[PDB]
Design a protein around this ligand. Structure first.
Ligand SMILES: c1ccc(CNc2cncc(-c3ccc4[nH]nc(NCCN5CCOCC5)c4c3)c2)cc1
Ligand SMILES: c1ccc(CNc2cncc(-c3ccc4[nH]nc(NCCN5CCOCC5)c4c3)c2)cc1
Lengths: 94, 91
Protein backbone atom coordinates (compact mmCIF):
# COMPACT_ATOMS: atom_id res chain seq x y z
CA UNK A 1 0.00 0.00 0.00
CA UNK A 2 1.67 3.19 -1.27
CA UNK A 3 0.40 6.67 -2.17
CA UNK A 4 1.33 7.79 -5.70
CA UNK A 5 4.82 6.90 -34.76
CA UNK A 6 7.02 3.82 -35.41
CA UNK A 7 7.00 2.05 -38.82
CA UNK A 8 8.49 -1.34 -38.00
CA UNK A 9 5.19 -3.18 -37.81
CA UNK A 10 4.62 -2.61 -41.55
CA UNK A 11 8.26 -3.08 -42.73
CA UNK A 12 9.19 -6.19 -40.75
CA UNK A 13 9.88 -9.57 -42.39
CA UNK A 14 7.36 -10.65 -39.74
CA UNK A 15 4.92 -7.75 -40.05
CA UNK A 16 2.22 -7.27 -37.45
CA UNK A 17 -1.19 -5.63 -36.93
CA UNK A 18 -2.07 -3.38 -34.02
CA UNK A 19 -5.11 -3.62 -31.76
CA UNK A 20 -6.53 -1.44 -29.01
CA UNK A 21 -7.15 -2.87 -25.53
CA UNK A 22 -9.79 -0.84 -23.68
CA UNK A 23 -10.63 -1.01 -19.95
CA UNK A 24 -11.88 2.11 -18.11
CA UNK A 25 -10.80 0.78 -14.70
CA UNK A 26 -7.15 0.68 -15.76
CA UNK A 27 -4.21 3.07 -16.15
CA UNK A 28 -3.06 3.25 -18.95
CA UNK A 29 -6.58 2.98 -20.36
CA UNK A 30 -5.68 1.66 -23.84
CA UNK A 31 -2.67 -0.49 -24.74
CA UNK A 32 -1.53 -1.14 -28.28
CA UNK A 33 -1.41 -4.92 -28.72
CA UNK A 34 0.42 -6.42 -31.70
CA UNK A 35 -0.84 -9.38 -33.74
CA UNK A 36 1.39 -11.28 -36.13
CA UNK A 37 0.18 -10.62 -39.68
CA UNK A 38 1.48 -13.89 -41.14
CA UNK A 39 2.22 -17.42 -40.06
CA UNK A 40 5.47 -17.50 -42.01
CA UNK A 41 7.84 -14.70 -42.94
CA UNK A 42 8.21 -12.40 -45.95
CA UNK A 43 11.04 -13.42 -48.29
CA UNK A 44 13.10 -11.32 -50.71
CA UNK A 45 10.23 -11.47 -53.25
CA UNK A 46 7.72 -10.32 -50.65
CA UNK A 47 5.83 -13.61 -50.59
CA UNK A 48 5.40 -15.61 -47.41
CA UNK A 49 8.04 -18.22 -46.71
CA UNK A 50 6.26 -20.83 -44.58
CA UNK A 51 9.62 -22.48 -43.82
CA UNK A 52 9.93 -19.73 -41.17
CA UNK A 53 7.70 -18.52 -38.34
CA UNK A 54 6.38 -15.11 -37.44
CA UNK A 55 6.16 -15.15 -33.64
CA UNK A 56 4.77 -12.52 -31.21
CA UNK A 57 7.23 -11.09 -28.67
CA UNK A 58 5.81 -10.24 -25.28
CA UNK A 59 6.52 -7.85 -22.41
CA UNK A 60 5.29 -7.95 -18.83
CA UNK A 61 3.79 -4.57 -17.94
CA UNK A 62 2.48 -3.09 -14.71
CA UNK A 63 -1.07 -1.75 -14.78
CA UNK A 64 -3.29 -0.10 -12.18
CA UNK A 65 -6.82 -1.53 -12.02
CA UNK A 66 -9.40 0.39 -9.99
CA UNK A 67 -10.35 -1.40 -6.74
CA UNK A 68 -13.05 -1.14 -5.58
CA UNK A 69 -14.43 -1.23 -9.13
CA UNK A 70 -14.83 2.17 -10.80
CA UNK A 71 -12.91 4.08 -8.12
CA UNK A 72 -10.90 7.17 -9.21
CA UNK A 73 -8.72 7.02 -6.07
CA UNK A 74 -7.91 3.39 -5.16
CA UNK A 75 -6.15 0.98 -7.52
CA UNK A 76 -4.58 -2.47 -7.55
CA UNK A 77 -1.14 -3.03 -9.10
CA UNK A 78 -1.37 -5.78 -11.71
CA UNK A 79 0.91 -7.47 -14.24
CA UNK A 80 -0.31 -8.37 -17.74
CA UNK A 81 1.41 -9.79 -20.83
CA UNK A 82 1.33 -7.58 -23.91
CA UNK A 83 2.49 -8.53 -27.40
CA UNK A 84 4.55 -5.61 -28.63
CA UNK A 85 5.70 -7.01 -31.96
CA UNK A 86 6.67 -10.03 -34.00
CA UNK A 87 10.05 -11.49 -34.82
CA UNK A 88 10.91 -14.07 -37.48
CA UNK A 89 12.28 -17.33 -36.06
CA UNK A 90 13.51 -20.57 -37.38
CA UNK A 91 11.12 -23.35 -36.25
CA UNK A 92 12.62 -25.60 -33.58
CA UNK A 93 12.84 -28.33 -36.20
CA UNK A 94 14.00 -26.32 -39.20
CA UNK B 1 -4.09 13.91 -8.84
CA UNK B 2 -2.58 11.80 -6.07
CA UNK B 3 -3.81 8.22 -5.98
CA UNK B 4 -3.72 5.09 -3.81
CA UNK B 5 -2.32 1.75 -4.98
CA UNK B 6 -2.28 -1.75 -3.45
CA UNK B 7 0.68 -4.09 -3.98
CA UNK B 8 8.35 -14.28 -20.56
CA UNK B 9 11.89 -13.21 -21.43
CA UNK B 10 13.15 -15.67 -18.77
CA UNK B 11 11.56 -18.64 -20.58
CA UNK B 12 11.33 -17.55 -24.24
CA UNK B 13 13.86 -18.68 -26.85
CA UNK B 14 12.99 -16.44 -29.82
CA UNK B 15 15.96 -14.21 -28.92
CA UNK B 16 18.57 -16.87 -29.92
CA UNK B 17 16.52 -18.30 -32.79
CA UNK B 18 15.39 -15.06 -34.53
CA UNK B 19 16.71 -13.66 -37.82
CA UNK B 20 17.27 -10.55 -35.71
CA UNK B 21 18.59 -12.20 -32.56
CA UNK B 22 19.11 -10.17 -29.43
CA UNK B 23 20.97 -9.93 -26.12
CA UNK B 24 19.50 -9.41 -22.65
CA UNK B 25 20.77 -7.08 -19.93
CA UNK B 26 19.25 -7.36 -16.47
CA UNK B 27 18.45 -4.24 -14.44
CA UNK B 28 18.00 -4.92 -10.73
CA UNK B 29 16.77 -2.03 -8.59
CA UNK B 30 15.45 -2.41 -5.02
CA UNK B 31 13.74 1.02 -5.03
CA UNK B 32 11.62 0.33 -8.12
CA UNK B 33 8.58 -1.64 -9.21
CA UNK B 34 9.25 -3.62 -11.25
CA UNK B 35 12.48 -4.35 -9.45
CA UNK B 36 13.85 -6.32 -12.44
CA UNK B 37 13.74 -5.22 -16.08
CA UNK B 38 15.42 -7.17 -18.89
CA UNK B 39 16.40 -4.82 -21.72
CA UNK B 40 16.89 -6.32 -25.18
CA UNK B 41 19.89 -5.35 -27.30
CA UNK B 42 20.10 -6.22 -31.00
CA UNK B 43 22.94 -8.72 -31.54
CA UNK B 44 23.64 -7.62 -35.11
CA UNK B 45 22.78 -4.57 -37.16
CA UNK B 46 21.95 -6.69 -40.19
CA UNK B 47 19.81 -9.82 -40.24
CA UNK B 48 20.54 -13.55 -40.50
CA UNK B 49 20.16 -15.27 -43.89
CA UNK B 50 19.46 -18.94 -44.66
CA UNK B 51 23.10 -19.95 -44.09
CA UNK B 52 23.37 -18.40 -40.63
CA UNK B 53 25.30 -15.43 -42.05
CA UNK B 54 24.51 -11.76 -41.52
CA UNK B 55 22.89 -9.88 -44.42
CA UNK B 56 23.85 -6.24 -43.92
CA UNK B 57 21.18 -5.09 -46.42
CA UNK B 58 18.36 -5.80 -43.92
CA UNK B 59 18.14 -4.25 -40.48
CA UNK B 60 17.80 -5.61 -37.00
CA UNK B 61 15.84 -3.01 -35.05
CA UNK B 62 14.70 -3.03 -31.39
CA UNK B 63 11.00 -3.00 -30.66
CA UNK B 64 10.22 -0.53 -27.86
CA UNK B 65 7.41 -0.53 -25.28
CA UNK B 66 6.32 2.19 -22.85
CA UNK B 67 5.90 0.66 -19.40
CA UNK B 68 4.80 1.97 -16.02
CA UNK B 69 7.43 2.27 -13.28
CA UNK B 70 7.06 3.17 -9.60
CA UNK B 71 9.89 4.88 -7.71
CA UNK B 72 6.11 7.09 -4.68
CA UNK B 73 6.14 8.59 -8.19
CA UNK B 74 4.67 6.96 -11.29
CA UNK B 75 7.05 7.11 -14.26
CA UNK B 76 7.08 5.96 -17.88
CA UNK B 77 10.20 4.41 -19.42
CA UNK B 78 10.79 2.89 -22.83
CA UNK B 79 12.14 -0.66 -22.72
CA UNK B 80 13.53 -2.62 -25.67
CA UNK B 81 11.63 -5.91 -25.64
CA UNK B 82 13.25 -7.65 -28.64
CA UNK B 83 14.44 -7.08 -32.22
CA UNK B 84 12.67 -7.58 -35.56
CA UNK B 85 14.12 -7.69 -39.08
CA UNK B 86 13.13 -4.74 -41.28
CA UNK B 87 13.72 -3.73 -44.81
CA UNK B 88 15.62 -0.40 -44.74
CA UNK B 89 13.42 2.52 -45.83
CA UNK B 90 15.30 2.47 -49.13
CA UNK B 91 15.64 -1.16 -50.12
C1 LIG C 1 18.15 -11.93 -44.13
C2 LIG C 1 16.86 -11.81 -43.67
C3 LIG C 1 15.80 -11.99 -44.52
C4 LIG C 1 16.03 -12.30 -45.84
C5 LIG C 1 14.89 -12.51 -46.78
N1 LIG C 1 13.77 -11.63 -46.47
C6 LIG C 1 13.71 -10.41 -47.17
C7 LIG C 1 14.75 -9.83 -47.85
N2 LIG C 1 14.69 -8.68 -48.52
C8 LIG C 1 13.51 -8.07 -48.50
C9 LIG C 1 12.40 -8.55 -47.85
C10 LIG C 1 11.13 -7.88 -47.84
C11 LIG C 1 10.58 -7.63 -46.61
C12 LIG C 1 9.37 -7.00 -46.47
C13 LIG C 1 8.75 -6.64 -47.64
N3 LIG C 1 7.56 -6.01 -47.86
N4 LIG C 1 7.27 -5.83 -49.16
C14 LIG C 1 8.32 -6.37 -49.80
N5 LIG C 1 8.49 -6.43 -51.14
C15 LIG C 1 7.42 -6.00 -52.00
C16 LIG C 1 6.44 -7.13 -52.21
N6 LIG C 1 5.16 -6.57 -52.73
C17 LIG C 1 4.17 -7.67 -52.89
C18 LIG C 1 2.90 -7.13 -53.50
O1 LIG C 1 3.21 -6.55 -54.76
C19 LIG C 1 4.03 -5.41 -54.54
C20 LIG C 1 5.37 -5.87 -54.02
C21 LIG C 1 9.28 -6.89 -48.89
C22 LIG C 1 10.50 -7.53 -49.01
C23 LIG C 1 12.51 -9.75 -47.18
C24 LIG C 1 17.31 -12.43 -46.30
C25 LIG C 1 18.37 -12.24 -45.45
C1 LIG D 1 11.98 -15.45 -44.80
C2 LIG D 1 12.69 -14.86 -43.78
C3 LIG D 1 14.05 -15.06 -43.69
C4 LIG D 1 14.70 -15.84 -44.61
C5 LIG D 1 16.16 -16.04 -44.50
N1 LIG D 1 16.52 -16.08 -43.10
C6 LIG D 1 16.68 -17.38 -42.58
C7 LIG D 1 16.02 -18.49 -43.06
N2 LIG D 1 16.15 -19.73 -42.59
C8 LIG D 1 16.99 -19.85 -41.56
C9 LIG D 1 17.69 -18.81 -41.00
C10 LIG D 1 18.58 -19.03 -39.89
C11 LIG D 1 18.40 -18.36 -38.70
C12 LIG D 1 19.24 -18.55 -37.63
C13 LIG D 1 20.27 -19.44 -37.84
N3 LIG D 1 21.28 -19.87 -37.02
N4 LIG D 1 22.12 -20.76 -37.59
C14 LIG D 1 21.64 -20.92 -38.82
N5 LIG D 1 22.10 -21.72 -39.81
C15 LIG D 1 23.34 -22.45 -39.65
C16 LIG D 1 23.69 -23.00 -41.02
N6 LIG D 1 24.87 -23.90 -40.96
C17 LIG D 1 26.14 -23.13 -40.87
C18 LIG D 1 27.30 -24.10 -40.90
O1 LIG D 1 27.28 -24.81 -42.13
C19 LIG D 1 26.12 -25.63 -42.14
C20 LIG D 1 24.89 -24.76 -42.17
C21 LIG D 1 20.48 -20.11 -39.02
C22 LIG D 1 19.62 -19.91 -40.08
C23 LIG D 1 17.53 -17.55 -41.52
C24 LIG D 1 13.99 -16.42 -45.63
C25 LIG D 1 12.64 -16.23 -45.73
Amino acid sequence: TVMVSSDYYNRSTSPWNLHRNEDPERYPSVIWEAKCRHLGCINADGNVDYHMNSVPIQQEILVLRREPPHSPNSFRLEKILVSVGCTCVTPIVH
